[PDB]
Structures are given as C-alpha cells and as structure tokens.
C-alpha cells in the first residue's frame, strides 16, 4: 500500500500500468494503490506489458473497484504532474519501503511519515517527498515524529583532473608547497570548493560537480599557479 | 654514526637467526624474498653499546646479553645491569651475504661499511663452492678491517672440520683475507658471548675516516609508502636508512646528484646548475640526531620528488657535495683483470674455467657501476685494455667496485674487475 | 577497390538466372585492409556470413541488422551537403556487396525496404546527434519488439495448440522452434520430439544439441528415412527461411518433400513466421531465386576409395546442390504469426495492414 | 575503424643494413595494402635517416633511453582508439598478408600469431585454435596441459621446427589489460 486510501477521488490524475490484454481492451493494473485490476486489425499486439502510462480518471465509484481509464480525453500538459506524482512517489516508496527490514506496521508506518506531512499542509505527493528533502537538511518539523528513535533520523562521476607538480629542490618542494597552499587560499576568496588530494605523488584533485561544468575555475587557478610562482624551478609537464 | 661492522657470508650455512642472536634487530621488508638458508639484502641492526667492566657485547636493551640460535644448549656469560644504558661508540652491526643474484645488495652496501667480518659456511660439501667469490666483489672497494669469522663446526663433521679452514684461507688467493685473523663465533650454540662477540667490536678501532669531507654518497636505499589509495601530505625525500661513507651530514649539508635525468640534448653530461638538497630529517638509529657522523648509518630522509622514490631503481648513485671533482667524459678505461675460475657450482672437471672470454664487436656488455649495470654495443676494443662502452652520462667519482657481468645462462656471470684512473 | 565476384567449378546451365559463390577464394585479396568506402566492421561481418559461422534466418538478419547500426552509428554526417540522401545511397552499396558476399534471404530484404523507409522518414531539419541516437533507438526497438516478442507471442499463441503424449518432428534450425518447444516445455505438456536432417549441410545437429540439453526425448534420422517415421507422428512444425505472398515457404532443400510426405500420411502440418519474413514479389518454383554452394563438401568415409575425390577433371559429372526450396500452397495447412492462426492461403490479407485497408 | 599500426624498435637495427637497414619489404607488404596513416614508435641516431625511405607516411615516435617491451604500448597508449597491428623487426616476408588479418576478423578474436616460414606450439584441427609454445629452457618443467582445455578440445597438434614472426593482430582490451596492469611485460613471453 502507498497512499492513505483506497480509491481516489472525482477527477483525480492516475498514473497506471498494464498488466495483460483483455477483450474490452487490456487489464491495467494500478501499483500506486497497491495493484488494483482494472480495464482501459493488429491492435492486440503485446507490445503494452508492463510499461507506466499516463491517464486520467473517468466516473465515480465508492467501493465497487470501478477502474476505467481514458486515455484520448486526458491533456499531456498536465501528464508531467502526473509524471510528478509518479517519480517523487516512487523514491518515496522505494526508500521507506528499505527503511522497514522485517505489512500494517508498514502502512501505519506510511500514514505516520507522509500523511502527517500531507494532514498538516495538504499536498499529494508533492511536498511529501520535498519535504522529506527539506527534514533531510532541517529535521525541526521531525521532532514532531514521537515515533521510537532509531527510525527518525535515518531521515555521481566528478572530473578527476590530474596533473602532477613537483620539484627535487628543498627550496623547490617549499614553492610548491608555498604556491599549491597558496591556490588554495585564492580558491577559498572566489569559493570552488573541494580541491583535495589522496595520492601524495601527483594531484588527484577532485573537479567536483557544483556547477558540473566548473572545468574552468579549477583549471585557471591552477594554471595561475602553473604560470605564476613554482615552475620557475623547473616545472615541466606531462598530463 | 661512527664504525660500521659487516658480517659477510657465502652459502648454504643460516644467516636469519643468528643475526637475531648477536646482532638484535633482523632484516624485513616488503615482497622481500628474505632468504632461503642465508639472506639476500644487507642485515642491519640498531646498537647502542656500552662496557661496564663486562667483556660481554649488550644492545641497547640494558638488562641481559644472550640470543636464540639453539635450542638445547645454553652457554652464557655476565650480561651486564640496568640504569639508562651509556654509549662507547655510534656502532651498529651491518652484514653483506654472499649469493651472486644480489650484486646491487652486495656491491652498494659493502664499501659504504667499515668494519668486515667474513664467514665460512658449514652447511656445504667437501668442495668449496662459493669461498673464493663473495668477498672477491670487496677486493677491489678495499675494506680495511677484515675477520675471518669463523662460523661452523657444530653438525660439521670430524674429517673435514679442524684444517680445511687453513685450505680455504688458502683458496681466497682473490679474496684480501691474508690480513684476516680469526675471532671465532657459533652460529647454533653462540658458546660464551663475552668473548666471542667482543673482539669483533673492541679489537676493530675507528677505520681511517675523514671527518669533514664532502658527502660523496653512494646511497643504499630510497623507499616510499605511496600505494594506490594513499594519504595527502607525504612530501619527503628518499625515506632511508642510510649508510654513508665520507662528509660529515649536518643540518643545512649540502649535497648534489649531478646528471639524475640526463640534461638537454642527451649527449653531454653537465650543465652548470647544481641539485640543491637540504637533509634535516635523519634517524641515527634510535634518535634524531641531525648531526651525522661519516663512515656508520644514519636513518635518512631527503626532500626531491616522492615519484622518484617508490622503486628503487637507483641502486648506488652517486651524491656529492659542491667541488664537483668527479670526471666528465664518456669513454670510460679501466685498469682491470680477469676472474681465474668459472666457480659458483663445485665439480671436479676443470672445463667450464677454460678461459676469460674478453670484450668483442657487435657483442653485448654489462658491468656493475658502483651498483648500476649499464652497457650497449661496441665498436673496436682492444686485448688488455678494459674500454667500458655505456648509454648514461653520469659524473659518477669513481667506480672502484665494479664486477664484470656476463651472461651463460639464466644467471649472469663474473669474469671481470677494474680500477678507474 | 571495386567488388567483385567469380564462378568455381562448374555452374549448370539449367540454372542461368542463378549464381554460383565459392567460400575457399580470397574476399580481401581485392581490398585493402583499412577501407572507409565500405565499412570494415559490416565487411568482416559478411566475412563471417560467408565462412559459413551464421546460418540461422532470424540469426543472420539480426546480426546484419547489428551490423548495420554500427555502421550508421560511427559514420557522423559530415557538414555542407545532404543529410539523409548521402547515407542511403551510401547504404546502398553496402548491401549490394552483403548481398555479393553471400546471397539474399527475405528477411534482410524486407529489413532493408525497412530502414530505407526509416531514413526517408526522418526529418531533415531535426539536427545530427539527437537523430543518430533517434533512429539508432528506433530500428533496435525495432528488432527488439518484432524478434523476441515474436518469440513470446508464438509460445502464447501456439502453446494453447499442443497436445499431451503426441510427438513432433521437425527439419532445419531456426531459434523459434526451440522457442516455441523449450518454453512449452518450462510450462509443462506431455510430449517427445523427433528431428530428421539431411545433407550436406547436416543440419539440425544444433537442434539435437540444444534439446538433448533441454531435457527433452528426441529421435534423430535423415529423410532416406522418412516415412519410416511418419506414421507416428500426430502433429509436425516447422521453421521457415522465407514466407510468399502465395501462401508458401521458401526454406531449407528438403521442406517441401516432408511437406509433400506429411500430407500423404495425413498428419497436419503447422508452420511458424512473422511479418517481416514474406516478400513483395512471388513465384512458382524455386529456380529463379535459389543459389548454390560449394560442389565439393560432398564426401563420404568409405575408405580412401572416395568416389568423389577427382570431381572437376571430369566435365560429365555435374554436382548441383539447391540450398533454398519453395513448397506449395495446398499441403502446408497453416502458418502462425504475431497475429494468431491463419490458413495458409489467407497469408496476404497482412498486405494491408499498413493503413488499416 | 582500423586505421593504425605500430612497430616495435627492439626485439624481445643500428649496424646491420643488408641493401638497407631491417625496414625494406615490412612497411611495403604493410603499406601496399592500405595502412597509410600509421604510428610507428622508434628510439636518436636512428631517427633521422627518413628521406631516402622514400615512404608515402612516416610517423617515428621516440622514446627514453633504456626501456623495455610493454612500455612503448604504455606510452604511445593515449592516442589509439580501434584496431591495431603490432610487428616487430624479426621478420622476412614472404606471403600474402591478408589472410591472417581476414581470419582475425573471421573470429571477431583479440589474439593472433604467425607461425610458419626447442620449438613447440600447438593449435587444433581446424588450425586455427591454440593453447600455448614451448621453448628450450623456459619449458625445465616438462609439459602441463590444463583439465578443461583439452577435456573439450580433442587433440592439439605440437609443431617442430618452424619460426615466430612476432606479428600480433590484436585490439584495445589487452592493451586496456597492459596500461592497468603495468608490471606485466615481456610481450614475447
């Protein structure tokens, strides 16, 4: 199970997925009330198993397990909401369904992580995920879980650039430890940050992905120091 | 660091834990190949010594004097007492085996110790088939203070045991042993130390040493710790524990390599920019002491790139002080002369030891450097003049041990020796 | 640098429309090794479909279809001409020397009216990596979808036809008789198989290799024997090289006698096709799109008496060996497609499909 | 894509010059058939004798001073990106060189020799499958062959007294295996 009820309401957006062809159309299952069956020349081709299709409610039901599905008189402006509704919900379901390890406990489980969130401000599965996005850097509205501990706050590639600087002279070495501290301290005023280094040979720094085409930054600073302080002690350069 | 002692032996007689017995700390290092009855790299010890009216030899461990080289048969001595053991001289025990694989081994780290001590086997056949080549590679280095350490006679039996050793001291015609007395040792029973391990230290004076020479180091180790996955700020040197030879080593001693890499356009071999090497960091044997005494081992370390110090493929390069008196030329003469066997298996067949086969044309060549074995093709060389043809510039001060290498098989071989102007 | 081709021994004169292609002649003798006029990879891929490696149809065609999206995959278009024009008349070429190296079946026909009706349909004004990577999708969506939910839809639509305790015999490999029988066989029927083969080519050996593996009973004989067998049979498939537009098969030398020797027991012959296995074009017999191989694999092991070993420095003694055979419409009873059952000439109500016609 | 080469300097050419020095007939056989945009890799004097070779493409690629085998695919490693033919200099030529780089296309392989015109090597009955050589000394242990390898394969055929030629038709992953694993050399052995 995943939301708070059982069928949704008038006019509700569904995300859903087919299961197998009938003869009125296909069985399409529905996973995100917990796999409820319903209904929608070589149209019977298979080539529809298995794959999440966007679609939109049609009449009312109240128990009856009415699923019908139109998907001619759905709009696809408002199928990326759909497709909001499916992706953020599917983390969701993904990361607390790891969070247990060991059936109602799960489901009272999720009407005590997202629908406490989703009772106090109403938004259906769309602020339950960014707000979980939001406690995983500001816990304060977590307190407010008085569950048991232990469950509270459990709540890519980086351009590996290299090129290695180095000297034989002591005077050398001290330039280069002068200099390289030195295009540390220029790259803290400007903030590229995370330039570190695991292999004393030459420079594993680490480009990182903070604008993911920062290439730049960290290359002209380190041309800076290529150009400006060590390599008059003879800096010469492979890649 | 003032007096460097060196145990040498040949094969086939046990040289890991008696240097555990006597000597105190064992060589170890890493994808080492240790040994297989004697070893294969140069066996250092760490020693502080000291004599408190006691003839007996301590460690710096001040409480007894023994070691672990029998089982059974304990013989032992006066070890000495306790209270913050005092210091006679910067000593330390250091040994050179004797295989012929370890030319790097035995040809870096045997004219940069200063005491020697030469061993006979006692785990080998009725022929002698290594005594007359592990210390001919020391001939030419010429060491001083030479022992006949007389080693084995325990399992050795009756017929071969009391007047083959005078045989051997007769069959070392190569080998400078002739000024070699006898300060006898056991390597399982290790019989009454006090005695036996004293004279190989109190008979052996200072060897002549020149106090405040240049550094002219031909160095025994460069080694680094920089695995795939390392740490950031291991900016260091060659991390060594190094013997040296001459120059005193003081804080702010200066001290070049002059080719390292061969300069621009590799066909010369010196430009006039000297290699700036400021050693603060070295390790005499306990302690820090920045203040290197010449001829015993320090524990070293330098500041040039840590790339250049992970495999240590410099095997006896040459490091001296500013007053660049090495030479500067490419064609490099030799004064030298032949090996009269083909020994190094025993037989009774005299027919591989037929002849000394000379230098050719178009006809390879090897020969070990200090310890560096370079070569390449030849032109015209005469009959009994040695004209060394090489591939490296290097403004090395003098190559004074050197072994001729040559290959028969497998293994290479020794023919040959030489002296440079 | 121009493709060229040769005859070996002797080609019958019975057979003038039809090539003769030797396999033991040098096909890089005339090219030099580095090439961009055609490419290498799609060339060492006809080398392989003319050392004899690949013989399956859907095999051959998948691997000629990999083949050529390699190809359309590291040829970028170059700026300053034509975007779609210049590389379907580069593919054309191409599979003029495929179709050289060894000979045309369907299935590379109708894939290749396939992707020139793809190329032609791409839109020109749509830029040059993100329609590369469009059709490079699009014609491997392609393949995936007909192959291997072809596969899925033949075993869920002819599984629901096999009995319980019959037995089946069938002749050539293609993969989707050992589908069809290896994932009914993982849903559990009663049966036994039977596989006859036949020569030179000794065929269906990997049939009996792969469902010795299966676990399931087989029998194995060759068609000397034929009707020796056919009396027990209760139903009998059959793979298929090539559909018709006249309700027939154009497959493997000996089809149609088994055809013709199965209706003469009366035992109901099935056969298994998709869509992209018939052609446009139609005939009578095979004598007009049939090639040939080499003559001398013929052999047999009695002795070093080999009857067969100075063939060709006697010219009255002609070895013509039909590889590819056509079989009529009114014996084979029915084929099954991606569609279901249908009989046999009913076959091209799927001509109009297309439009919905 | 196919469109390199390269050739090893040393084997394992100063002095000897027979009507020329060890490159007469090699680059013709290599080049009569294509191949002209090539890497070749060399080591000084050598290098600069290379107008009266009269060749349509010559690329040298020198090197450092006392190197090894696996170190020049080491270093000339970060521009090749297809199908590569490594040679060496023990070599006549004496055959049409297509068949052997028509057979490694013929298998989609990685690995090829050249064995034809002390001495085992052995091969199956198409002639076209192998294990491993045996040489002279190496070989103090006598001979292994492993369970599996011949448990499917039937029989090998050990060959006598023919000789290497060193070619190796070959593609990126052993090279991909040789930058990785570095230590690993001794490309004959």
């Known amino acids: 199970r995943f939301y708070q009820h059982k069928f949704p309401e008038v006019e ?113 599965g769309y602020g339950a995920y960014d707000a979980f996005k939001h406690a995983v850097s500001d816990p304060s509205i977590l307190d407010s879980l008085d569950l048991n501990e232990d469950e509270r706050e459990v709540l890519a590639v980086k351009i590996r650039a290299d090129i290695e600087v180095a000297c034989y002279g002591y005077e050398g070495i001290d330039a280069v430890k002068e200099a390289l501290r030195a295009g540390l301290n220029c790259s803290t005023e400007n903030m590229p940050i995370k330039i570190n280094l695991i292999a004393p040979p030459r420079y594993v720094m680490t480009t990182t992905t903070l604008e993911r085409t920062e290439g730049l930054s960290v290359l002209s600073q380190a041309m800076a120091v290529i150009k400006e302080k060590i390599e008059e002690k003879r800096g010469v350069f492979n890649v | 660091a003032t007096i460097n002692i060196g145990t040498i032996g040949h094969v086939a007689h046990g040289k890991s834990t008696v240097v555990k017995a006597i000597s105190g700390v064992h060589t170890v290092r890493f994808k080492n190949e240790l040994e297989r009855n004697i070893t294969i790299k140069l066996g250092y010890a760490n020693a502080k010594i000291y004599k408190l009216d006691d003839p007996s030899c301590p460690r710096p461990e001040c409480y007894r004097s023994c070691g672990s080289s029998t089982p059974d048969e304990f013989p032992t001595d006066i070890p000495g007492t306790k209270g913050n053991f005092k210091l006679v001289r910067h000593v330390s025990f250091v040994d050179c085996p004797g295989h012929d694989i370890l030319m790097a081994t035995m040809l870096n780290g045997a004219a940069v110790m200063d005491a020697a001590l030469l061993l006979i086997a006692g785990n080998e056949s009725c022929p002698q088939p290594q005594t007359s080549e592990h210390l001919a590679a020391i001939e030419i280095m010429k060491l001083k203070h030479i022992l006949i350490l007389q080693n084995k006679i325990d399992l050795v039996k009756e017929s071969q045991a009391k007047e083959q050793y005078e045989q051997i001291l007769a069959f070392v015609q190569g080998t400078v042993a002739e000024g070699a007395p006898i300060i006898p040792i056991s390597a399982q029973l290790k019989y009454n130390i006090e005695v036996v391990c004293e004279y190989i230290v109190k008979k052996i004076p200072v060897p002549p040493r020149d106090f405040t020479s240049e550094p002219r180091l031909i160095v025994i180790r460069s080694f680094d710790v920089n695995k795939p996955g390392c740490e950031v700020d291991d900016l260091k040197g060659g991390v060594a524990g190094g013997s040296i030879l001459k120059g005193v080593l003081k804080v702010g001693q200066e001290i070049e390599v002059r080719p390292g890499i061969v300069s621009k356009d590799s066909e010369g071999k010196l430009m006039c920019k000297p290699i700036f090497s400021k050693i603060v960091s070295l390790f005499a044997e306990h302690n820090d002491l920045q203040y290197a005494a010449p001829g015993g081992l320090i524990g070293v370390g330098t500041k040039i790139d840590p790339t250049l110090c992970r495999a ?84 090395t001060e003098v190559g004074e041990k050197i072994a001729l290498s040559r290959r028969v098989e497998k293994h290479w071989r020794l023919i040959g020796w030489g002296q440079i102007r | 640098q121009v493709p060229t081709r040769k005859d070996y021994g002797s080609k019958v004169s019975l057979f003038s429309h039809l090539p003769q292609y030797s396999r033991q002649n040098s096909l890089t003798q005339f090219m030099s090794i580095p090439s961009s006029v055609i490419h290498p990879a799609m060339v060492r891929l006809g080398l392989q479909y003319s050392q004899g490696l690949v013989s399956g149809s859907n095999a051959r065609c998948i691997a000629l279809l990999r083949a050529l999206q390699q190809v359309i995959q590291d040829y970028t278009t170059p700026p300053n001409e034509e975007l779609s024009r210049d590389l379907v008349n580069k593919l054309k070429p191409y599979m003029s020397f495929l179709t050289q190296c060894r000979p045309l079946s369907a299935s590379m026909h109708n894939a290749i009216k396939f992707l020139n009706k793809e190329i032609t349909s791409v839109g020109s004004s749509k830029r040059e990596e993100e329609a590369k990577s469009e059709l490079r999708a699009a014609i491997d969506r392609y393949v995936q979808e007909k192959i291997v939910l072809a596969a899925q839809a033949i075993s869920r639509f002819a599984y629901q036809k096999i009995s319980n305790g019959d037995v089946i015999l069938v002749y050539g490999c293609s993969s989707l008789v050992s589908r069809i ?99 446009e074009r139609v005939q009578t017999d095979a004598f007009v799109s049939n090639e040939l191989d080499d003559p001398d694999d013929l052999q047999c092991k009695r002795g070093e008496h080999v009857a067969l070993a100075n063939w060709q420095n006697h010219a009255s003694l002609r070895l013509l060996n039909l590889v590819y055979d056509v079989t009529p419409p009114e014996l084979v009873d029915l084929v099954i497609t991606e569609l279901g059952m249908i009989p046999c000439s009913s076959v091209p109500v799927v001509l109009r499909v297309k439009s919905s016609d | 894509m196919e469109f390199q080469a390269v050739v090893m300097a040393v084997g394992g050419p100063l002095l000897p010059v ?172």
């Open chain 1, 12 to 124: 509700d957006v569904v995300m859903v997925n087919v299961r197998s062809i009938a003869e009125m159309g296909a069985y399409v299952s529905l996973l995100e009330y917990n796999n409820i069956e319903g209904m929608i020349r070589s149209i019977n081709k298979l080539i529809r198993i298995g794959r999440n299709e966007c679609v939109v409610v049609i009449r009312v039901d109240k128990e009856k397990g009415y699923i019908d599905l139109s998907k001619r008189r759905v709009s696809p402006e408002e199928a990326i909401k759909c497709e909001d509704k499916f992706t953020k919900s599917k983390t969701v379901y993904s990361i607390l369904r790891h969070v247990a390890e060991v059936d109602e406990q799960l489901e009272s489980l999720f009407q005590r992580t997202a629908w406490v969130f989703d009772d106090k401000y109403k938004r259906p």
């Open chain 2, 312 to 395: 240590d493929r410099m095997v006896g390069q040459v490091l001296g002080a500013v007053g660049a008196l090495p030479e500067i030329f490419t064609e490099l003469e030799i004064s030298y002369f032949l090996l009269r066997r083909l020994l190094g298996v025993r037989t009774e067949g005299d027919k591989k030891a037929a002849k000394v086969q000379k230098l050719s044309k178009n006809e390879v060549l090897m020969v070990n450097i200090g310890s560096l074995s370079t070569g390449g093709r030849v032109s015209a060389v005469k009959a009994d003049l040695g004209k060394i043809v090489l591939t490296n510039p290097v403004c």
């Open chain 3, 181 to 279: 029988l290896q994932e009914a066989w993982t849903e559990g029927r009663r049966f036994r198989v039977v596989v006859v083969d036949s020569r030179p080519w000794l065929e269906g050996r990997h049939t009996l290799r792969s469902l010795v593996h299966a676990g399931v009973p087989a029998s194995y004989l060759l068609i000397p024997a034929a009707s020796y067998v056919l009396p027990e049979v209760s139903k009998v498939l059959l793979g298929a090289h090539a559909l018709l537009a006249n309700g027939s098969v154009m497959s493997r030398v000996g089809t149609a006698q088994l055809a013709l020797v199965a209706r003469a027991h009366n035992v109901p012959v099935l056969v298994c096709c998709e869509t992209y296995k018939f052609c």
């Open chain 4, 18 to 189: 027979g009507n020329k020095p060890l490159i007469w007939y090699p680059l013709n056989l290599l080049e009569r058939v294509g191949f002209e945009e090539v890497i070749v890799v060399t080591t000084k004097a050598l290098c600069a004798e290379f107008k009266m070779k009269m060749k349509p493409d010559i690329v040298c690629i020198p090197d450092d001073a006392d190197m090894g085998t696996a170190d020049s695919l080491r270093y000339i490693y970060p521009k090749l990106k297809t199908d590569v033919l490594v040679l060496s200099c023990d070599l006549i030529t004496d055959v049409a060189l297509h068949e052997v780089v028509d057979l490694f296309r013929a298998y989609d392989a990685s690995l090829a020799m050249l064995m034809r015109k002390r001495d085992f090597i052995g091969v199956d009955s198409t002639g076209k499958r192998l294990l491993f050589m045996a040489n002279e000394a190496d070989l103090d242990e006598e001979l292994v062959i492993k369970g599996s390898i011949l448990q499917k394969h039937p029989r090998i055929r050990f060959h006598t007294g023919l000789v290497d030629a060193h070619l190796y038709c070959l593609k990126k992953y052993i090279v991909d295996f040789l930058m990785e694993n570095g230590s690993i050399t001794s490309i004959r052995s």
